[PDB]
Design a protein around this ligand. Sequence first.
Ligand SMILES: Cc1cc2nc3c(=O)[nH]c(=O)nc-3n(C[C@H](O)[C@H](O)[C@H](O)COP(=O)(O)OP(=O)(O)OC[C@H]3O[C@@H](n4cnc5c(N)ncnc54)[C@H](O)[C@@H]3O)c2cc1C
Ligand SMILES: N[C@@H](CCCNO)C(=O)O
Length: 410
Amino acid sequence: VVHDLIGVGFGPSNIALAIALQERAQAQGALEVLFLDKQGDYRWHGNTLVSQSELQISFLKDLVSLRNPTSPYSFVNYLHKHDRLVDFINLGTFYPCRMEFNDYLRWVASHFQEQSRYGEEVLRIEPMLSAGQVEALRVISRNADGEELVRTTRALVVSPGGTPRIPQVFRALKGDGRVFHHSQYLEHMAKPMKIAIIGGGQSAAEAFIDLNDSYPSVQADMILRASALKPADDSPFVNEVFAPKFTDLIYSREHAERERLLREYHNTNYSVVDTDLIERIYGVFYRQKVSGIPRHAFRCMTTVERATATAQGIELALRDAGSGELSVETYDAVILATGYERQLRQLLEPLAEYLGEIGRDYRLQTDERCKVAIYAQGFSQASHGLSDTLLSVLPVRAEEISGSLYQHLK
Ligand SMILES: Cc1cc2nc3c(=O)[nH]c(=O)nc-3n(C[C@H](O)[C@H](O)[C@H](O)COP(=O)(O)OP(=O)(O)OC[C@H]3O[C@@H](n4cnc5c(N)ncnc54)[C@H](O)[C@@H]3O)c2cc1C
Ligand SMILES: N[C@@H](CCCNO)C(=O)O
């Protein structure tokens, strides 16, 4: 009945953690562990897996290799197990398609069937009081059939990923199927049509290229408030900001200096597009100048000031900061390629009375009444750096959280 650890989510963060726990098991004893994921059939951002979607990190930053290249869960071992390693080598790329990395993640996760529970959404975590002290946590979940489940645990790891960021102007249109966040792209995309894409980062660029390449009757407008698509910085000195060593460095810094570092290196990860994809998009617009056929529009320096549902489509009032002018365009669909927030608090709401920043070891600081350990993954960019929301340091974070957990449970 009483688990050692329950995890919210079984994406890369918690899969990497399950591996690190398994490595420690022989020397330190196997723990009683469950990871719950709301997806019935696990995919890694499955509704974003368009034909042109390259991984934006080296395959060597897989779930294990930075810690343990001899792990059977390395991307290289995965290829070898699928009789594909020589073929992959002939490709000569560090960047597999995201569809292949999705297959890799599913393959790794399929080794943890005793620990995973799919189709279970965690709704809230409650304190189990015993003589005034929180000795355990109640994890309340709902399965796909709508049944409630209640489980008990000594420790919790919260790794639910981000939530879609919706600009305020589009909030009134929640529930209108014509407006959707890029995270649901494939679900909604599944006859001359006009589609607006809001944003100018990697997701907006991928959405645009997919429309251009696969939906010949779609006229796409990239609507971005910034002046240009700008390239993602992965040059090698800059890229050291993702190294495991940087985690210690940023954590050691005072708050003003942490914020300065994050501002300085913002363009390694946010509001930026892979250089080759920028060149591809620029080429699409350049060819329109050659042909005189303006299928698509690049609306830079443009802000959506109003968005209204009409019988004819979604009407957007567009302010061009270059000219100060307002125009009105109507679209058949609007894709919000506007990224994600990391906040996660109905989940942890019943524990608000006991909470504090996060520790170096990713443990939420609680007052002395709380005897249980709660960890969170992907919510600590402010203190641990730009690797926090990415695949970048997962093998090392997994070793760090798993170490701390054993130390706590000893
Ligand atoms: C489109 C896209 C592309 C990306 N590409 C890259 C890339 O190329 N390289 C890179 O390094 N990073 C990339 N990222 C960053 C991404 O955050 C990480 O790669 C990684 O997915 C984070 O792992 P995670 O397990 O912390 O979160 P997630 O992968 O988001 O997993 C969270 C899991 O929690 C589950 N969940 C959420 N709420 C609940 C609930 N309450 N109960 C139960 N389960 C729940 C979800 O079903 C999900 O499976 C990308 C992100 C996106 C959105
Ligand atoms: N350049 C980073 C990954 C950045 C991913 N951003 O989308 C790294 O090498 O860890």
